[PDB]
Design a protein around this nucleic acid. Structure first.
Ligand SMILES: [Mg+2]
Ligand SMILES: [Mg+2]
Ligand SMILES: [Mg+2]
Ligand SMILES: [Mg+2]
Ligand SMILES: [Mg+2]
Ligand SMILES: [Mg+2]
Ligand SMILES: [Mg+2]
Ligand SMILES: [Mg+2]
Ligand SMILES: [Mg+2]
Ligand SMILES: [Mg+2]
Ligand SMILES: [Mg+2]
Ligand SMILES: [Mg+2]
Ligand SMILES: [Mg+2]
Ligand SMILES: [Mg+2]
Ligand SMILES: [Mg+2]
Ligand SMILES: [Mg+2]
Ligand SMILES: [Mg+2]
Ligand SMILES: [Mg+2]
Ligand SMILES: [Mg+2]
Ligand SMILES: [Mg+2]
Ligand SMILES: [Mg+2]
Ligand SMILES: [Mg+2]
Lengths: 261, 178, 145
RNA sequence: UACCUGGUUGAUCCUGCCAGUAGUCAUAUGCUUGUCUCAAAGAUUAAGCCAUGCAUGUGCAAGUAUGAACCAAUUUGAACUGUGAAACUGCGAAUGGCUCAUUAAAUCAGUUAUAGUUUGUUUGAUGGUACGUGCUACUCGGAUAACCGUAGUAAUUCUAGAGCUAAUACGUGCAACAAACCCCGACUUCUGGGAGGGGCGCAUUUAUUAGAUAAAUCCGAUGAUUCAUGAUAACUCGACGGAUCGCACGGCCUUCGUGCCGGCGACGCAUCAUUCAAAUUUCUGCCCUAUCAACUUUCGAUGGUAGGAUAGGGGCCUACCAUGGUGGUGACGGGUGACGGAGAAUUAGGGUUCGAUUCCGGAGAGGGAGCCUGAGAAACGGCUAC
RNA sequence: CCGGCAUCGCGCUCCUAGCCCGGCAUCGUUACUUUGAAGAAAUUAGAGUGCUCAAAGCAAGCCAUCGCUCUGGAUACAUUAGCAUGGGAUAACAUCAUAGGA
RNA sequence: CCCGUCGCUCCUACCGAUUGAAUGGUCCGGUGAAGUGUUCGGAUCGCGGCGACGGACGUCGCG
RNA sequence: GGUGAACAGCCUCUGGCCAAUGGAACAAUGUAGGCAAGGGAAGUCGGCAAAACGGAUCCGUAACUUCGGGAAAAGGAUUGGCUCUGAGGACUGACAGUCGACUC
């Protein structure tokens, strides 16, 4: 039409928001922000629909305008903020930290972390290039721009950032054999170790990953995300250690949980 | 207004295209500038998409011309338009337009060329053993005004910038000027 | 000289001919040497596009067009225009009601550089570029006769 | 539930249709109707016409207050203290919503591309020189609404004039080095220089140059670039480089002087990236019609070159040149009681028919056409004309 | 159902490259076929769930049903066009006889 | 059993002089509102330079 | 000779003429030529007479047809002056020199 669309209808909402169908006509319409806004969750979905600390739009407004809800080292009072992958959401009054990760079935969990693994975050880089006066800088998929990059940190790689020094402390070089976890598509959620990476001139680079227990799959580059060097992750995985389990297997889990009680 | 739409054209097969929209702004045009060469220098603001500004140069006399073979770029004053690769009428009515051929003062270039105690003549003798200075441009200095190719977009940026002719381009335009 | 044939002097942008300090081996496109660009994708820049005198701003190798998008193969259907051909993309179509194939086709205008030399009905490989004209969105990258 | 039944005959076996049979998230209507849950409803005809009323306005501690009010009420110094209605300023009104008229490779779907572009905002990073002969900043303008007052008009958020008073409205204008380097350049000693002093932010445009190899001291990206970016010479009557607003006070005297000072924010300028997007754009795909076989092209048709315009590619337009483009694989033309799609009904399978409609995309606001503001409109709950 | 082998396997220098050595680049196209990715939800199929059933909905269930636990909110389909991997049976195109061959 | 002409009633379509008629479109040409851009234009309105002149005047500064 | 498509009309050169009985006046009716407001064939047997159209370039051109035409159908646009630009040639030694009356 004749400008930006400022309403979002619940059915048009991303499928991983889980939100119901007769709940209304409209959805939170996540504001423009630092993350892709189709791969994100508004802090209203973080508060009302997952943690249930409120029960209405206006009560979530009270939550956020109290200045309690602090994201990534700094309080964000916007109620449609596109919080997404490894954004850390802290609450001083509850002294309670959360970190937003994919779970194996393609959705977002809020995994609790203690303070030491909440002092910092971890994100991949979009691309590193020069700027004014020849000073190099790199761009992350969180949008952050970092100047004077370590001369070895390259594109597609991963970098840890503290919230006080607010710069790089270490980086994982995206390469063969380091644990990744896909962040988009049908394979999203599953962690695994890269086992192969083939490139075709002029198209998306394909990443073949193997899970911790035998299964193998493939993914496009924009979706994969190294976590740690080697098999060991540098982040606390959720209750499913990044293994997507077949529906038969997950039926057996619930059957066994039934027959164990 | 003036429109850049592909709607009013035919199709590639040659059939008419029934209209389905009313004209949109983001397919507009604006009427050309026909930048004259005149003393009463006049460049007017136009406010375009994105809110930024373009400089419609209605008429200029003073331009900015480079000399690549010696890498010196001097302000100068335009003399006249003498050749224009699309239309003779544009030469006739003296419109400043990209890839046109104007004539320039040679005053900044002469006074530069005289440039380039013992510290001075030592540097002059270090140079001036490499002067080549083709006769085709030297005779043009002796005539007192140089051919130059305007390379800016005066209706787009509001300037008459350009470069002095040398070499095959000089000699080809020359061989058309007689 | 032959290639300068129009009412303007044809010349390659940002390439400066009559320079003082010139040398035959610095990099092409610099110090008076003709510009060319390896379009890539395994396509090899032709020898006469290297040592060619023609000046052509729509050539993939020597011009200002970048080959990006999708790549097609077709056949030269006619070479009756200036620096352009129409490639016919024969293929087959699936009629789902009938489980059979009907052959459809499409004529595609494609810009050739003067480096290439096409006769009617020559296998060609073309790649997508910026819109050069009303109908031309492709440049010829390979010609197999 | 992958189905048949009555009718040509004196009777028979057929081809064959007629009629029966069942559904419709498919409408109308007729008869009838006690309870619960659910919930389409001026689309088809008239994208015909509209009385009335509403549907888009906005206020924080943080742009502007003794102009007139309310609450505090004064040791009668200063506040306008605190609540602020009106108004200026800023922002939104380009979303929502309604409809399907026009439109049949067009919109639209899947899939690309932008290295061919603009993008208020978000988020993150970022920013010297304003003149002083680059030897540390150099000065503070009235008028304007609301108010008061005098009025025309029959008249409308019609309208002239006087008196007042602000700015984050408007308009000026202080500038943080070594200048790193770049070009001139007195004389010295001869210079390969010392050089004494004279010219140089960031954006805009133009131009030069660099942006590095291969087996017997080279350093970013791409699948692909003269890319990212640097240096240079300039260039602009330069948009810009903060005359803004909040609280909480609180270490310590240099002249003990609200004194040396100092943090946390709000707003705002510009650049890059991100995001919200847009706009173009590649391939393939759409119903019936040959009683629609040639259509396009002087006046843009297809292409080339140069330019103009656009935010940008492009015959989008101009000048010149070439003689091309589509078609029996159905162009062009005509019909459509035709917006496209996700999908709906029916279904053994395959299909047949439908899809105005609440989700996505497009298009319109009586019919056309043209523009202001703005980041965003060819807006119609904006204007101009017929 | 298949890995790898050898037989009368044109070579590979380079990443994947053995405890001299498997499984390495470029130097005919397609279709077909397998697998993979990306694939908007709503609709449909289909898993769980005693809205009392049911159409539905996406909830909700168990603690001593005392200051909280366990949560789910699956999965499929998506023909045609495009991208990518394995095969070469079947089927078209082009074509070693001038050798301008290796 | 049955074919056709003729006579009559009714329905439907056809040809048909009438430069037939109406509605709606499309093209060429004529006229052309209006807006946008442009040239001149200059109603008034801003340091109100200077005459060192008595709130005034002309030279007025350019915008 | 000029214009012009032109042995059209109009004007001039060589050659030839001012020969047609003259003076005054400008009344009616005439013969020949024009022009008229508004209307536009009502006039009259009848558009008789007059007016209108008229060259050229570009576009467009119906019914009917013996397929040759109708056709210069009908219906439109342009045309001056002056200053330019472009294209079309000849002779001589893909270029150079010399010349060139015209047409678009
Ligand atoms: Mg809308
Ligand atoms: Mg059946
Ligand atoms: Mg019978
Ligand atoms: Mg019977
Ligand atoms: Mg029936
Ligand atoms: Mg309708
Ligand atoms: Mg209406
Ligand atoms: Mg162009
Ligand atoms: Mg319709
Ligand atoms: Mg809609
Ligand atoms: Mg609209
Ligand atoms: Mg409108
Ligand atoms: Mg309305
Ligand atoms: Mg003549
Ligand atoms: Mg005659
Ligand atoms: Mg008359
Ligand atoms: Mg008569
Ligand atoms: Mg009569
Ligand atoms: Mg009579
Ligand atoms: Mg009569
Ligand atoms: Mg007559
Ligand atoms: Mg006739």
């Amino acid at each position: 039409a004749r400008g930006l669309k400022k309403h979002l209808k619940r059915l048009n909402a991303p499928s991983h928001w889980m939100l119901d169908k007769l709940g209304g006509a409209f959805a939170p319409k996540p504001s423009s922000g630092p993350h892709k806004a189709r791969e994100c969750l508004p802090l209203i979905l973080i508060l009302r629909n997952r943690l249930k600390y409120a029960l209405t739009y206006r009560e979530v407004q009270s939550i956020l305008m109290q200045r309690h809800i602090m994201v990534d080292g700094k309080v964000r009072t916007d109620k449609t903020y596109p919080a997404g992958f490894m954004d850390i959401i802290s609450i001083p009054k509850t002294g309670e930290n959360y970190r937003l990760l994919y779970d194996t079935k393609g959705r977002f969990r809020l995994h609790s972390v203690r303070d030491e693994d909440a002092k910092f975050k971890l994100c991949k880089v979009r691309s590193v290039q020069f700027g004014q006066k020849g000073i190099p800088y790199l761009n992350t998929y969180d949008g952050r721009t970092i100047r004077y990059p370590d001369p070895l940190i390259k594109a597609n790689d991963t970098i840890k950032l503290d919230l006080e020094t607010n710069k790089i402390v270490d980086f994982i070089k995206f390469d063969v054999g380091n644990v990744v976890m896909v962040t988009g598509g049908r394979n999203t959620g599953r962690v695994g170790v890269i086992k192969n990476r083939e490139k075709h001139k002029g198209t998306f680079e394909t990443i073949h990953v193997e899970d911790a227990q035998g299964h193998q799959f493939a993914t496009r580059l924009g979706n994969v995300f190294t976590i740690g060097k080697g098999t060991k992750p540098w982040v606390s995985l959720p209750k499913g250690k990044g293994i997507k389990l077949t529906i038969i297997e997950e039926q057996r889990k619930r059957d066994a949980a039934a027959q164990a009680a | 207004g003036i429109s850049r739409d592909s709607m009013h054209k035919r199709r590639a097969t040659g059939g008419k295209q029934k209209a389905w929209r009313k004209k949109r702004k983001y397919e507009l045009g604006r009427q050309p500038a026909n930048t004259k060469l005149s003393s009463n220098k006049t460049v007017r603001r136009v406010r375009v998409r994105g809110g930024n500004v373009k400089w419609r140069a209605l008429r200029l006399d003073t331009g900015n011309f480079s000399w690549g073979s010696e890498a010196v770029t001097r302000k100068t004053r335009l003399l006249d338009v003498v050749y224009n690769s699309s239309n003779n009428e544009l030469v006739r009515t003296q419109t400043l337009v990209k890839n046109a051929i104007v004539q320039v003062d040679a005053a900044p270039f002469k006074q530069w060329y005289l440039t380039h105690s013992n510290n001075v003549q030592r540097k002059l003798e270090k140079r001036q053993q490499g002067r080549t200075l083709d006769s085709h441009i030297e005779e043009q200095f002796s005539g007192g005004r140089l051919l130059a190719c305007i390379s800016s977009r005066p209706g787009q940026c509001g300037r008459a910038d350009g470069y002095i002719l040398e070499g095959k381009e000089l000699e080809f335009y020359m061989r058309k000027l007689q | 000289m032959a290639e300068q044939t129009e009412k303007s002097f044809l010349k390659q942008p940002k390439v400066f001919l009559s320079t003082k300090k010139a040398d035959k081996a610095k990099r092409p496109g610099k110090a008076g040497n003709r510009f060319w660009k390896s379009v890539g994708l395994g396509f090899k820049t032709p020898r006469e596009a290297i040592d060619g005198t023609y000046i052509d701003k729509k050539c993939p190798f020597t011009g200002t067009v970048a080959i990006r998008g999708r790549i097609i193969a077709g056949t030269c259907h006619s070479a009756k225009m200036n620096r352009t051909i129409i490639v016919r993309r024969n293929y087959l179509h699936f009629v789902k009601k009938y489980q059979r194939y009907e052959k459809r086709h499409s004529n595609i205008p494609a810009h050739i550089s003067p480096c290439f030399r096409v006769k009617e009905g020559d296998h060609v490989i073309i790649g997508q570029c910026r819109p050069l004209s009303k109908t031309v969105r492709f440049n010829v990258l390979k010609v197999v006769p």
